[PDB]
Design a protein around this nucleic acid. Structure first.
Ligand SMILES: [Mg+2]
Ligand SMILES: [Mg+2]
Ligand SMILES: [Mg+2]
Ligand SMILES: [Mg+2]
Ligand SMILES: [Mg+2]
Ligand SMILES: [Mg+2]
Ligand SMILES: [Mg+2]
Ligand SMILES: [Mg+2]
Ligand SMILES: [Mg+2]
Ligand SMILES: [Mg+2]
Ligand SMILES: [Mg+2]
Ligand SMILES: [Mg+2]
Ligand SMILES: [Mg+2]
Ligand SMILES: [Mg+2]
Ligand SMILES: [Mg+2]
Ligand SMILES: [Mg+2]
Ligand SMILES: [Mg+2]
Ligand SMILES: [Mg+2]
Ligand SMILES: [Mg+2]
Ligand SMILES: [Mg+2]
Ligand SMILES: [Mg+2]
Ligand SMILES: [Mg+2]
Ligand SMILES: [Mg+2]
Ligand SMILES: [Mg+2]
Lengths: 50, 70, 107, 50, 80, 155
RNA sequence: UAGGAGGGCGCGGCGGCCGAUGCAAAACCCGGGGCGCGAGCCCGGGCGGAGCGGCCGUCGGUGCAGAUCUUGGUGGUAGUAGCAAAUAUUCAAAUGAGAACUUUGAAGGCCGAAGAGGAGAAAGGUUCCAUGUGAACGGCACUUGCACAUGGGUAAGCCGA
RNA sequence: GGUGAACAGCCUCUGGCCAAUGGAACAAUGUAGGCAAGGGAAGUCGGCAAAACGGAUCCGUAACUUCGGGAAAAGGAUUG
RNA sequence: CGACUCUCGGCAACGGAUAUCUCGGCUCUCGCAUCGAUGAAGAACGUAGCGAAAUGCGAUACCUGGUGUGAAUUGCAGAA
């Protein structure tokens, strides 16, 4: 719930569904799928990933 | 050239056992440069990697033995 | 000098008494040793068909006479030890059998 | 095991981050004595025992 | 037998990680830590082992609070 | 860095060293003791002809148990010798390295010969082995330091 | 012999006295020359590169060949005993400085399905996967790995808790 | 899958392997496994070890007995 | 003559004694009295541009603020 809320306030998008897992090294990793209104390419280049 | 990454990824794709994948000896260069399941599938469709046929276990003597028991 | 000759390897007398789990490997050792004596080259390469022929009848029975052809040829490899080697392969046998077949020399 | 408590996963994370040979550069810090990492652990030799 | 035949059946845990002391000494069935006595209110400590008294006395930890008490004593517990 | 025995003449000599060599000290002692005072070229030929199992290196001091052979009747009449391959190969690597150093100085390689060959134990490397009744024992190698000096022959 | 007493040699300090010391102190080595019946002492040679003695008084954790003595190291033993159950390996090729041990292909055999097959509970903890690798390890060997280094990987409203 | 009463053993297919350090030789003594003329326990403390019997169909099955057993008793015959 | 065994002498190894040290220990003496429900000792997890440990610190995380001093930190790189 907090992950979707923050992904909305930052980056001004929404998540249609988030998956989470705690990676073995220790931190948590979250897969935030965007509702297909927004484009992940566009966000990845708005923050610089790819 | 070690192809232990390609006997696996091929028994998985060809859905056989590692003893049924056949990798042509002549083109180990291209087989080795093939580095993914996607590339294994293009090699399978291009004919370099083959499913060997199943070893024959014919029941013909069994059938003849029964057809001589009736 | 490059040369191809057809020999008959009496293998019973060279494998007699050998342990079963070793009669075929000793058959291959005797083929190499026989090519070495016959053509003086230390390097003998056995063709996969000669191997298959010898190994086809198990490990504990091997053909008794194997009509082989040994081809001493030039070692064309720029890096090499010897100036020539011998490549032994299985050889076609006439229908009349090995009756009176000596050592011939192939054209 | 495959069903591990979050406490044990939490502590495996740290016993993972505690396995690296000492950095290459520490070795030149002034008046230095740390030579190799004498607190290595191997999965087959020294069991954590927890 | 005893020995080789019998060390193969070590498969369960008598002790898991205690929460008050962090050691692997929490007897599960008995529900008590064999090192810090837990869940008892007071800590298990005995004078037949001064070594085990020093290994877990005061001073071997962060002293997150009392390390500042001497400094606060100097200047007589002052707030500005 | 400086060896046990300095050459007769230092300007006409080449030297090669190997420290902490992982090869059996006893085998390489007997190799050196077989090779001392041979010519460089006959030493290369002899030592390769040993590596190729054609001619033997007699065992004299550390020889209790070494079985007999005929290939060594020339230099040890009782016929007791072996063919240390790993040691002969290490000594060949040092012989080639000293022949190279002698070429770099500028001596007649064909006139070189083994002036001074020494084998000398090094720090034993350790590994543990397992014995009946759960008793573990040392399993330790005896590596050697091998030094040699090739000096040009003089009339 | 047990045992006793006297006079001495030696070690480490303390209070004094006499000095040596980068023209080489301490320590240690010698087929070096001596002195003493003896503990020991003096000098030479060498390595060594910074501190050291001798005398009187005084003190003490002071003298080693033993204790199935403690710790550490090193021998002979000894290149010796030995690496032997689970049927089995062989031939071309390729890579590599190097091939019995890596990889491919052809062959020949074994597990023979209450399996030497496919999955889990426990327990382990990153062993999983890729790229590479000087050592060490893999009780032979290695181009190799469950070894070493750098990265990657574990997604649940429905399986669980 | 086959034989077989059978998840016995023995061979095969799917799947997995050839991982157990290799080369040469056939001496004693060993360890595991065989075979032996005439005799068959004389060996030995003791038939210890090994051999002989072993499936199935048909017949027959004693003393004794708690009348349930003995019993697959014993002794025979057949097998493709 | 030569090999082996014992040995003597020179050098080189093996090994870490001896000598010179010492941000350590031990002993004696002295000064003060200051933990915790306003959450302590201890434990755990995190925390650095490149850190694992030790040393700090707590999502403000090898620190923030004040004050004093008065030009650095430092294995490297970087804003200064
Ligand atoms: Mg989840
Ligand atoms: Mg284990
Ligand atoms: Mg049980
Ligand atoms: Mg219990
Ligand atoms: Mg022997
Ligand atoms: Mg044990
Ligand atoms: Mg004393
Ligand atoms: Mg004292
Ligand atoms: Mg003593
Ligand atoms: Mg032996
Ligand atoms: Mg054995
Ligand atoms: Mg079952
Ligand atoms: Mg399994
Ligand atoms: Mg090894
Ligand atoms: Mg793996
Ligand atoms: Mg049937
Ligand atoms: Mg069956
Ligand atoms: Mg008989
Ligand atoms: Mg009898
Ligand atoms: Mg008798
Ligand atoms: Mg009798
Ligand atoms: Mg009797
Ligand atoms: Mg019996
Ligand atoms: Mg009866």
């Amino acid at each position: 719930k907090k992950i979707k809320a923050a992904v909305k306030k930052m980056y001004d998008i929404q998540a249609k569904k988030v998956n989470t897992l705690i990676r073995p090294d220790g931190k948590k990793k979250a897969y935030v799928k965007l509702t297909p209104d927004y484009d992940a390419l566009d966000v990845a280049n708005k923050i610089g990933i790819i | 050239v070690s192809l232990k990454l390609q006997k696996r990824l091929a028994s998985s794709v060809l859905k056989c056992g590692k003893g049924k994948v056949w990798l042509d000896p002549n083109e180990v260069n291209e087989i080795s440069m093939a580095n993914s399941r996607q590339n294994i599938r293009k090699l399978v469709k291009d004919g370099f990697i083959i499913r060997k046929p199943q070893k024959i276990h014919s029941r013909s003597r069994a059938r003849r033995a029964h057809e001589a028991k009736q | 000098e490059v040369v191809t000759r057809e020999y008959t390897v009496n293998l019973h007398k060279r494998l007699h008494g050998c342990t079963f789990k070793k009669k075929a490997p000793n058959a291959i050792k005797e083929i190499r040793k026989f090519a070495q004596k016959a053509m003086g080259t230390n390097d003998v390469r056995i063709d996969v068909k000669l191997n298959k022929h010898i190994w086809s009848s198990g490990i504990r029975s091997v053909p008794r006479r194997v009509r082989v052809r040994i081809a001493r040829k030039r070692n064309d490899e720029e890096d090499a030890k010897e100036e020539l080697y011998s490549l032994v392969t299985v050889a076609e046998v006439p229908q009349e059998g090995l009756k009176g077949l000596g050592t011939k020399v192939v054209e | 095991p495959s069903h591990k408590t979050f406490r044990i996963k939490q502590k495996l994370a740290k016993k993972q981050r505690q396995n690296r040979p000492i950095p290459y550069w520490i070795r030149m810090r002034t008046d230095n004595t740390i030579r190799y990492n004498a607190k290595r652990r191997h999965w087959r030799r020294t069991k954590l025992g927890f | 037998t005893k020995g080789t035949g019998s060390f193969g059946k070590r498969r369960n845990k008598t002790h898991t990680l205690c929460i008050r002391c962090g050691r692997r000494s929490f007897h599960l069935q008995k529900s008590t830590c064999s090192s810090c006595g837990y869940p008892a209110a007071r800590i298990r400590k005995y004078n037949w082992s001064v070594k085990a008294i020093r290994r877990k006395t005061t001073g071997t930890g962060r002293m997150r609070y009392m390390r500042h008490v001497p400094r606060r004593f100097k200047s007589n517990f002052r707030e500005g | 860095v400086k060896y046990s025995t300095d050459p007769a003449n230092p300007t006409k000599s080449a030297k090669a060293m190997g420290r902490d060599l992982r090869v059996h000290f006893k085998n390489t002692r007997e190799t050196a003791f077989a090779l001392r005072k041979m010519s460089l070229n006959k030493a290369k030929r002899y030592l390769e002809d040993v590596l190729a199992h054609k001619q033997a290196i007699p065992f004299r001091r550390y020889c209790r148990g070494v079985g007999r052979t005929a290939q060594v009747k020339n230099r040890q009449p009782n016929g007791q010798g072996r063919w240390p391959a790993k040691s002969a190969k290490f000594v060949l690597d040092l012989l080639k390295n000293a022949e190279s150093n002698a070429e770099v100085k500028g001596l007649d390689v064909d006139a070189l010969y083994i002036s001074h060959i020494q084998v000398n134990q090094a720090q034993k490397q350790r590994r543990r082995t397992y014995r009946a009744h759960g008793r573990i024992n040392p399993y330790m190698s005896n590596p050697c330091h091998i030094e040699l000096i090739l000096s040009e022959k003089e009339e």
